[PDB]
Amino acid sequence: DNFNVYKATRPYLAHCPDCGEGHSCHSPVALERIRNEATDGTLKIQVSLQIGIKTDDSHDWTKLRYMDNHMPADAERAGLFVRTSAPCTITGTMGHFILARCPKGETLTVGFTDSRKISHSCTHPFHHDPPVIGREKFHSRPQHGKELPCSTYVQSTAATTEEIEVHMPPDTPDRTLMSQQSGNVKITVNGQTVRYKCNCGGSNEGLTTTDKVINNCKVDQCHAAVTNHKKWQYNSPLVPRNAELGDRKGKIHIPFPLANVTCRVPKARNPTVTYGKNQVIMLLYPDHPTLLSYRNMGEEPNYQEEWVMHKKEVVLTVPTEGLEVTWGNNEPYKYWPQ
Amino acid sequence: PVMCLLANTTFPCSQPPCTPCCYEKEPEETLRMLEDNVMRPGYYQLLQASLTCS
């Protein structure tokens, strides 16, 4: 129980098409992969930051860690928000993964508030319209109802089945490493491994752990980057691959896997029925959109279906073979003439 | 019976030579060791043992 996978990994900065107002940025809350495989409507969202873990690698549910330019910084879990058209209800949070129940929307936004009060967000175009479980379009899940097979991402913190690819981060460019020393270029290492390249005859191109000086050179004619081989980062398509290593990769187990569960669906109230000669009359009173379907119990079934929205009276002919009527999630009503 | 690799020496995945605290002692070579054992079946036994300290 002394095992901590989060000490090897780190939160990161990745590309986001909309950070707010309609402009792109290097987001600390950048969206990776939004999974909508769960039939119950639950979304499995992947983000560049890590939730429930502090910068010192210790686990704290009220804490959140994001990449603050060069080094990771701490933020509050309460400040984290998920929204489409209206705010989403967050059900589970652990590392790079968020579980949320979202209403009908065209875009998905995931944001948070840092220690300095600045709000960071990321918007992706995501068509969210969860499918109807059963034959009734209900808003709230009942405690009792018809048991239907449905899928959801389990609230459990335990990571055992699903996995993601992790690797070394690319070299982080930093112009502050280079300074103009009338009239030379000085590279201030500051205890870091720096990869440099200059358009000057003095120094060529290489890797350094020591302070370098480029005699008769301009700062604009030079490029410097910070190397990091001590941490792991998710194999993100929004972040460049490590130029030197490349194919070198690792793998880590992820929380909230998709599982086969049971969904409770409500049964619409039985309609008032009046019988006629070789026909049946039903006064349907739906509280929500309910599917009405019917078939003949003979050689020719002649299946017909309609979604009933308001108070409606339906006239259905009952043949010699019999007529089977299904009103929403209720068990089918069978009719036969005397 | 599952075995893991380190440069030219073979060791059991659950029992690495770096233990205790593999990442704390050497953070660079621990990740490098794990990167070389990804195709191997006992990778998660090595991942659990290497990232365990106190």
Added chain:
Amino acid sequence: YEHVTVIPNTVGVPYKTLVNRPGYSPMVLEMELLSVTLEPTLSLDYITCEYKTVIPSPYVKCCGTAECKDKNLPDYSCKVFTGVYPFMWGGAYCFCDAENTQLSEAHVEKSESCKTEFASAYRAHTASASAKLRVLYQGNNITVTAYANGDHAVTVKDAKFIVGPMSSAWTPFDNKIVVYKGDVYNMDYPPFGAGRPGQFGDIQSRTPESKDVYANTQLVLQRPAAGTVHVPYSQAPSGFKYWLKERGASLQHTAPFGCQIATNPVRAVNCAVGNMPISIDIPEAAFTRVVDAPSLTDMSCEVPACTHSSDFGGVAIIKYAASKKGKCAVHSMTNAVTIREAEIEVEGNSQLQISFSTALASAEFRVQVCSTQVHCAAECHPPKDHIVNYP
């Protein structure tokens, strides 16, 4: 004694059969089908699910040219874009202005959901017919479960039961079927290795956990945005996801003959089609000789209440004079009317009360109590409802 009878293939309807062994007192058996199962022989072709577009970190080569290699992966796409100048937080990622390249890589595989969320494409062969029958034998209800092939013999209370063979070999399933959870569909799905993009079977695999992956999703890599490190692409969206919302009603709702569809195993339940013969080899001990059975005489029948309906809406009181105390079988000799009770206890100069069902307004029927028959005169009246929820 082997009693051969035929009942219609309708579940929930109690049928009455008269066993008249020569020289032995008549026997009345009540038979009711609890369930009729038609299980087709299935052969799994492939499964389909939501695909996963595996896109690793793009190889951004600063001051040089990256090279694509042909990889043996499903829908493997590789493109090298020239004149690339990407940016990170601290500025430009590359030193060169026009001499940098970006290698974009992508392939298709099964998603993590495939083990849970999947549709199975099956081939349906010759179906196996089976039935669950309730028999009121010797004043007790017995359950007989047997294959409706007319060969499988089941012995309950020393009585040998042979069910079938079914008059109709009809099944609601076609040669090709698609199964998703509790729903079954008749579908002419694309063959293995011939799936089209954006349609059912865009990704094809032998089993949900197998290594083989067939993919045809039209994966095309696009040039990344100015100063941006990302892997843009054009791809036909999941054919499985699109099918889940556009599949329509399953065989449970569309099938003829009022078929109910169940899964694990895939089967047709209570299909009201044709009829089925029943062979009941009744043992010697169950029968009683006419001489050893009570003799009925001085019989009169009065019908105080009758309503012609599907349910037993008629009441009949029969006055009699029995030779001795015992058990007598009750059966209607007229096919138009059916009596609820099969056996009653006779004493002497007493009266019996029986419940009957008819469709006739003027019911003229014969009631056989043991070996003697009694005529019942009934003037049955129409009921309130023209439609009833029972056949």
